[PDB]
Enzyme design. Structure first.
Site, PDB file in Angstrom:
ATOM      1  N   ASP A  14       6.729  -9.053   9.718  1.00  0.00           N
ATOM      2  CA  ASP A  14       5.685  -8.055   9.948  1.00  0.00           C
ATOM      3  C   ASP A  14       6.267  -6.828  10.646  1.00  0.00           C
ATOM      4  O   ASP A  14       6.676  -6.691  11.680  1.00  0.00           O
ATOM      5  CB  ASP A  14       4.553  -8.635  10.798  1.00  0.00           C
ATOM      6  CG  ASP A  14       4.927  -8.750  12.257  1.00  0.00           C
ATOM      7  OD1 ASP A  14       5.840  -9.540  12.564  1.00  0.00           O
ATOM      8  OD2 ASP A  14       4.315  -8.045  13.091  1.00  0.00           O
TER       9      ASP A  14
ATOM     10  N   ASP B 268       1.991  -9.699  13.998  1.00  0.00           N
ATOM     11  CA  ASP B 268       1.021 -10.148  13.007  1.00  0.00           C
ATOM     12  C   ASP B 268       1.625 -11.369  12.309  1.00  0.00           C
ATOM     13  O   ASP B 268       2.332 -11.241  11.309  1.00  0.00           O
ATOM     14  CB  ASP B 268       0.761  -9.042  11.984  1.00  0.00           C
ATOM     15  CG  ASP B 268      -0.494  -9.287  11.167  1.00  0.00           C
ATOM     16  OD1 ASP B 268      -0.833 -10.472  10.945  1.00  0.00           O
ATOM     17  OD2 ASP B 268      -1.135  -8.297  10.741  1.00  0.00           O
TER      18      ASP B 268
ATOM     19  N   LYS C 181       0.790  -1.231   0.000  1.00  0.00           N
ATOM     20  CA  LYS C 181       0.000   0.000   0.000  1.00  0.00           C
ATOM     21  C   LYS C 181       0.823   1.283   0.000  1.00  0.00           C
ATOM     22  O   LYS C 181       0.360   2.323  -0.475  1.00  0.00           O
ATOM     23  CB  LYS C 181      -0.948   0.016   1.204  1.00  0.00           C
ATOM     24  CG  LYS C 181      -2.075  -1.007   1.128  1.00  0.00           C
ATOM     25  CD  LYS C 181      -3.040  -0.859   2.297  1.00  0.00           C
ATOM     26  CE  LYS C 181      -4.236  -1.789   2.152  1.00  0.00           C
ATOM     27  NZ  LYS C 181      -5.198  -1.647   3.284  1.00  0.00           N
TER      28      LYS C 181
END
Ligand SMILES: CCCC(=O)Nc1n[nH]c2cc(-c3ccc(O)cc3)ccc12
Length: 251
Positions: free
Chosen positions: A151, A133, A20
Protein backbone atom coordinates in the site's frame (compact mmCIF):
# COMPACT_ATOMS: atom_id res chain seq x y z
CA UNK A 1 24.29 9.35 -6.39
CA UNK A 2 21.70 6.94 -7.81
CA UNK A 3 20.80 4.69 -10.75
CA UNK A 4 19.12 6.06 -13.87
CA UNK A 5 16.32 3.79 -15.14
CA UNK A 6 14.51 4.09 -18.46
CA UNK A 7 11.53 2.40 -20.08
CA UNK A 8 13.89 0.84 -22.63
CA UNK A 9 15.57 -1.01 -19.75
CA UNK A 10 12.53 -3.24 -19.27
CA UNK A 11 10.68 -5.84 -21.29
CA UNK A 12 6.99 -5.23 -20.54
CA UNK A 13 4.85 -8.26 -19.76
CA UNK A 14 1.18 -8.86 -19.01
CA UNK A 15 -0.94 -6.38 -17.01
CA UNK A 16 -1.25 -7.30 -13.33
CA UNK A 17 -3.78 -4.66 -12.38
CA UNK A 18 -5.64 -1.59 -13.59
CA UNK A 19 -5.65 1.25 -11.08
CA UNK A 20 -7.21 4.72 -11.04
CA UNK A 21 -4.02 6.52 -12.09
CA UNK A 22 -2.57 3.85 -14.36
CA UNK A 23 -1.64 0.19 -14.80
CA UNK A 24 0.79 -2.21 -13.20
CA UNK A 25 2.57 -4.63 -15.53
CA UNK A 26 4.82 -7.62 -14.99
CA UNK A 27 8.25 -6.68 -16.33
CA UNK A 28 11.68 -8.10 -16.95
CA UNK A 29 14.82 -5.98 -16.58
CA UNK A 30 16.58 -6.45 -19.94
CA UNK A 31 20.05 -6.85 -18.45
CA UNK A 32 19.61 -9.01 -15.34
CA UNK A 33 16.39 -10.60 -16.68
CA UNK A 34 15.17 -10.13 -13.10
CA UNK A 35 11.38 -10.35 -12.78
CA UNK A 36 9.56 -7.35 -11.29
CA UNK A 37 6.39 -5.26 -11.55
CA UNK A 38 6.14 -1.91 -13.29
CA UNK A 39 3.51 0.57 -12.06
CA UNK A 40 2.76 3.18 -14.73
CA UNK A 41 1.12 6.35 -13.42
CA UNK A 42 -0.27 9.11 -15.65
CA UNK A 43 0.60 12.69 -14.68
CA UNK A 44 -2.48 14.24 -16.27
CA UNK A 45 -4.63 11.96 -14.11
CA UNK A 46 -2.58 12.48 -10.94
CA UNK A 47 -2.86 16.25 -11.35
CA UNK A 48 -6.62 16.23 -12.01
CA UNK A 49 -6.96 14.52 -8.62
CA UNK A 50 -4.31 16.59 -6.87
CA UNK A 51 -2.73 13.49 -5.33
CA UNK A 52 0.73 14.26 -6.69
CA UNK A 53 1.82 15.61 -3.31
CA UNK A 54 0.67 12.32 -1.79
CA UNK A 55 2.40 10.09 -4.36
CA UNK A 56 5.69 11.92 -3.88
CA UNK A 57 5.38 11.55 -0.11
CA UNK A 58 4.65 7.81 -0.23
CA UNK A 59 7.49 7.10 -2.67
CA UNK A 60 10.03 8.78 -0.38
CA UNK A 61 8.81 6.73 2.59
CA UNK A 62 8.45 3.48 0.63
CA UNK A 63 12.01 3.87 -0.63
CA UNK A 64 13.39 3.78 2.92
CA UNK A 65 11.28 0.82 4.02
CA UNK A 66 13.16 -2.48 3.76
CA UNK A 67 11.35 -5.44 5.33
CA UNK A 68 10.64 -8.96 4.00
CA UNK A 69 6.92 -8.49 4.63
CA UNK A 70 6.71 -5.12 2.89
CA UNK A 71 6.64 -5.00 -0.92
CA UNK A 72 9.92 -3.49 -2.08
CA UNK A 73 10.05 -0.28 -4.11
CA UNK A 74 13.26 -0.65 -6.13
CA UNK A 75 13.21 2.74 -7.82
CA UNK A 76 11.40 5.01 -10.25
CA UNK A 77 11.75 7.26 -13.27
CA UNK A 78 9.54 9.37 -15.52
CA UNK A 79 9.03 10.74 -19.00
CA UNK A 80 6.96 13.35 -20.84
CA UNK A 81 3.62 12.22 -19.40
CA UNK A 82 4.20 9.21 -17.14
CA UNK A 83 5.72 8.24 -13.80
CA UNK A 84 6.99 4.68 -13.42
CA UNK A 85 7.47 2.81 -10.14
CA UNK A 86 9.72 -0.25 -10.11
CA UNK A 87 8.28 -2.79 -7.65
CA UNK A 88 8.94 -6.22 -6.25
CA UNK A 89 6.95 -8.96 -7.95
CA UNK A 90 4.82 -11.13 -5.64
CA UNK A 91 4.22 -14.34 -7.67
CA UNK A 92 1.41 -15.89 -5.58
CA UNK A 93 -0.93 -12.91 -5.83
CA UNK A 94 -3.18 -11.31 -3.25
CA UNK A 95 -4.47 -12.55 0.07
CA UNK A 96 -7.83 -11.21 -1.11
CA UNK A 97 -7.85 -13.69 -4.01
CA UNK A 98 -6.84 -16.54 -1.69
CA UNK A 99 -9.58 -15.53 0.74
CA UNK A 100 -12.21 -15.62 -1.98
CA UNK A 101 -10.99 -18.98 -3.23
CA UNK A 102 -11.00 -20.64 0.20
CA UNK A 103 -13.94 -18.63 1.66
CA UNK A 104 -12.05 -18.48 4.99
CA UNK A 105 -8.58 -19.30 6.36
CA UNK A 106 -7.73 -21.93 8.98
CA UNK A 107 -6.08 -20.90 12.25
CA UNK A 108 -2.54 -21.74 11.12
CA UNK A 109 -2.60 -19.62 7.96
CA UNK A 110 -4.28 -16.75 9.80
CA UNK A 111 -1.92 -16.79 12.77
CA UNK A 112 1.01 -16.79 10.36
CA UNK A 113 -0.32 -13.79 8.40
CA UNK A 114 -0.99 -11.85 11.59
CA UNK A 115 2.55 -12.60 12.71
CA UNK A 116 4.02 -11.27 9.46
CA UNK A 117 1.76 -8.19 9.55
CA UNK A 118 2.64 -7.50 13.19
CA UNK A 119 6.35 -7.71 12.36
CA UNK A 120 5.95 -5.40 9.37
CA UNK A 121 3.83 -2.97 11.39
CA UNK A 122 6.31 -3.06 14.25
CA UNK A 123 9.11 -2.22 11.81
CA UNK A 124 7.03 0.59 10.31
CA UNK A 125 6.39 2.08 13.72
CA UNK A 126 10.09 1.94 14.57
CA UNK A 127 10.43 4.24 11.55
CA UNK A 128 7.58 6.51 12.67
CA UNK A 129 5.41 5.21 9.82
CA UNK A 130 1.80 4.49 10.77
CA UNK A 131 -1.69 3.92 9.43
CA UNK A 132 -1.01 1.34 6.71
CA UNK A 133 -3.89 0.20 4.51
CA UNK A 134 -3.63 -3.54 5.17
CA UNK A 135 -6.91 -4.64 3.65
CA UNK A 136 -6.69 -8.10 1.95
CA UNK A 137 -6.50 -6.54 -1.53
CA UNK A 138 -3.36 -4.67 -0.46
CA UNK A 139 -1.66 -7.84 0.75
CA UNK A 140 0.49 -9.77 -1.72
CA UNK A 141 2.13 -13.19 -1.43
CA UNK A 142 5.78 -13.94 -2.15
CA UNK A 143 7.24 -17.07 -3.75
CA UNK A 144 6.96 -18.98 -0.47
CA UNK A 145 3.53 -17.66 0.41
CA UNK A 146 4.96 -15.00 2.72
CA UNK A 147 2.81 -11.91 3.17
CA UNK A 148 3.73 -8.54 1.60
CA UNK A 149 2.07 -5.26 2.52
CA UNK A 150 1.49 -3.42 -0.76
CA UNK A 151 0.00 0.00 0.00
CA UNK A 152 1.50 2.84 -2.09
CA UNK A 153 -14.72 1.89 5.64
CA UNK A 154 -14.83 -1.64 7.03
CA UNK A 155 -11.31 -1.23 8.39
CA UNK A 156 -11.47 2.23 9.95
CA UNK A 157 -11.27 2.37 13.77
CA UNK A 158 -13.81 4.19 15.97
CA UNK A 159 -11.51 7.17 16.57
CA UNK A 160 -11.21 7.93 12.86
CA UNK A 161 -14.89 7.68 11.91
CA UNK A 162 -15.90 9.54 15.08
CA UNK A 163 -13.64 12.41 14.05
CA UNK A 164 -10.99 12.27 16.75
CA UNK A 165 -7.21 12.17 17.06
CA UNK A 166 -5.47 8.90 16.23
CA UNK A 167 -1.99 7.37 16.48
CA UNK A 168 -0.17 4.12 15.77
CA UNK A 169 -2.95 2.33 17.66
CA UNK A 170 -5.08 2.49 14.53
CA UNK A 171 -2.85 -0.29 13.14
CA UNK A 172 -3.75 -2.51 16.09
CA UNK A 173 -7.44 -2.11 15.27
CA UNK A 174 -6.74 -2.87 11.59
CA UNK A 175 -4.96 -6.04 12.65
CA UNK A 176 -8.05 -7.05 14.63
CA UNK A 177 -10.35 -6.47 11.67
CA UNK A 178 -8.03 -8.55 9.43
CA UNK A 179 -7.67 -11.42 11.89
CA UNK A 180 -11.47 -11.68 11.99
CA UNK A 181 -11.89 -11.46 8.20
CA UNK A 182 -9.19 -14.10 7.64
CA UNK A 183 -10.89 -16.58 9.99
CA UNK A 184 -14.46 -15.66 9.03
CA UNK A 185 -14.42 -14.65 5.37
CA UNK A 186 -15.79 -11.12 5.80
CA UNK A 187 -14.86 -8.06 7.92
CA UNK A 188 -16.62 -7.91 11.35
CA UNK A 189 -18.64 -4.73 10.82
CA UNK A 190 -20.16 -5.43 7.40
CA UNK A 191 -23.64 -3.91 6.96
CA UNK A 192 -25.99 -2.77 4.16
CA UNK A 193 -25.24 0.96 4.40
CA UNK A 194 -22.22 3.11 5.22
CA UNK A 195 -24.36 4.60 7.98
CA UNK A 196 -24.99 1.16 9.48
CA UNK A 197 -21.31 0.23 9.23
CA UNK A 198 -20.25 3.45 11.00
CA UNK A 199 -22.71 2.65 13.78
CA UNK A 200 -21.48 -0.95 14.02
CA UNK A 201 -17.88 0.27 14.32
CA UNK A 202 -18.57 3.06 16.83
CA UNK A 203 -20.38 0.64 19.12
CA UNK A 204 -17.90 -2.15 18.36
CA UNK A 205 -20.83 -4.39 17.50
CA UNK A 206 -19.87 -7.67 15.82
CA UNK A 207 -20.44 -11.37 16.44
CA UNK A 208 -18.32 -14.54 16.32
CA UNK A 209 -19.35 -17.60 14.27
CA UNK A 210 -19.34 -20.88 16.28
CA UNK A 211 -16.09 -22.12 14.70
CA UNK A 212 -13.97 -19.24 16.02
CA UNK A 213 -11.97 -20.63 18.94
CA UNK A 214 -11.40 -19.17 22.39
CA UNK A 215 -7.85 -18.10 21.59
CA UNK A 216 -8.89 -16.21 18.45
CA UNK A 217 -11.80 -14.48 20.26
CA UNK A 218 -9.49 -13.32 23.00
CA UNK A 219 -7.00 -11.79 20.55
CA UNK A 220 -9.63 -10.23 18.27
CA UNK A 221 -11.69 -8.86 21.19
CA UNK A 222 -8.57 -7.21 22.59
CA UNK A 223 -7.47 -5.70 19.27
CA UNK A 224 -10.95 -4.34 18.64
CA UNK A 225 -11.22 -2.21 21.78
CA UNK A 226 -13.02 1.12 21.37
CA UNK A 227 -10.44 2.79 23.60
CA UNK A 228 -7.08 2.73 21.71
CA UNK A 229 -5.03 2.57 24.93
CA UNK A 230 -6.83 -0.66 25.81
CA UNK A 231 -5.47 -2.35 22.68
CA UNK A 232 -2.42 -4.62 23.12
CA UNK A 233 1.02 -3.64 21.89
CA UNK A 234 2.40 -5.35 18.79
CA UNK A 235 4.85 -7.41 20.82
CA UNK A 236 1.93 -8.59 22.98
CA UNK A 237 0.25 -9.73 19.77
CA UNK A 238 3.36 -11.67 18.84
CA UNK A 239 3.45 -13.28 22.28
CA UNK A 240 -0.24 -14.10 22.35
CA UNK A 241 -0.70 -17.82 23.09
CA UNK A 242 -3.12 -18.22 20.21
CA UNK A 243 -0.44 -16.77 17.91
CA UNK A 244 2.43 -18.83 19.35
CA UNK A 245 0.22 -21.91 19.17
CA UNK A 246 -0.80 -21.51 15.53
CA UNK A 247 1.75 -19.43 13.63
CA UNK A 248 3.79 -21.65 11.34
CA UNK A 249 6.52 -19.02 11.57
CA UNK A 250 8.46 -17.38 14.42
CA UNK A 251 8.42 -13.63 15.10
C1 LIG B 1 -0.08 -13.65 -10.31
C2 LIG B 1 0.29 -12.17 -10.40
C3 LIG B 1 0.36 -11.52 -9.01
C4 LIG B 1 0.73 -10.03 -9.08
O1 LIG B 1 0.13 -9.25 -9.82
N1 LIG B 1 1.74 -9.73 -8.23
C5 LIG B 1 2.42 -8.44 -7.94
N2 LIG B 1 3.72 -8.22 -7.78
N3 LIG B 1 3.94 -6.92 -7.52
C6 LIG B 1 2.79 -6.17 -7.49
C7 LIG B 1 2.49 -4.83 -7.27
C8 LIG B 1 1.16 -4.35 -7.30
C9 LIG B 1 0.83 -2.91 -7.04
C10 LIG B 1 0.55 -2.48 -5.72
C11 LIG B 1 0.23 -1.13 -5.43
C12 LIG B 1 0.20 -0.18 -6.47
O2 LIG B 1 -0.11 1.14 -6.23
C13 LIG B 1 0.48 -0.60 -7.79
C14 LIG B 1 0.80 -1.95 -8.07
C15 LIG B 1 0.13 -5.28 -7.58
C16 LIG B 1 0.42 -6.66 -7.82
C17 LIG B 1 1.74 -7.14 -7.78
Amino acid sequence: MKRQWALEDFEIGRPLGKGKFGNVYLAREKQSKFILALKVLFKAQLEKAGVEHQLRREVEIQSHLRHPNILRLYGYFHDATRVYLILEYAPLGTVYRELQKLSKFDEQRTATYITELANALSYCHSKRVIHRDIKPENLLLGSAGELKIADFLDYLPPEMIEGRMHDEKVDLWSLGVLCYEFLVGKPPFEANTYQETYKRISRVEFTFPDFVTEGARDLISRLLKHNPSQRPMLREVLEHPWITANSSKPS
